[PDB]
Design a protein around this ligand. Structure first.
Ligand SMILES: [Mg+2]
Ligand SMILES: [Mg+2]
Lengths: 83, 83
């Protein structure tokens, strides 16, 4: 098994800009074969041996977002910086 | 005496974007000759008879801001959206 990865429970929600229902991140990461443990608001995710592409929290975010679907991500224009 | 005006004690601080010291609003409004009473967090201000221009809380904001000096107002760029 690859080394474990610590990631905030709401990190996929913050990156996607979507308040996913509770347990959405943990269920998806378990669906792809990873061991998910809880420690307050921080998850510890050990990806399966056939997923060495999962090395960082960003890799885990891609798993939750692609399984939940990118079509649920809303179109929100960022604020205009004073250019 | 013109009719009394009710205004939050922090309204000049919000309009100016400046955290004025404690009691600055009530001090400046009594200086120009108004009667100031405290009802929790809301002030009740009765302008003097020689100040009929003081009819709304915005007029009271100008009195506090101009006596403290507009130079203390910082320069912050607004959050303009994508045009
Ligand atoms: Mg990936
Ligand atoms: Mg005025």
């Amino acid at each position: 098994s690859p080394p474990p990865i610590r990631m905030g429970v709401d990190v996929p929600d913050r990156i996607a800009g979507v308040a996913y229902p509770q347990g959405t991140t943990a269920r998806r990461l378990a669906q792809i074969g990873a061991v998910v443990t809880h420690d307050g608001d921080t998850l510890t995710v050990t990806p399966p041996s056939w997923r060495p592409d999962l090395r960082q929290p960003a890799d885990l975010v891609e798993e939750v977002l692609r399984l939940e679907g990118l079509e649920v991500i809303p179109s929100v224009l960022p604020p205009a910086p004073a250019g």
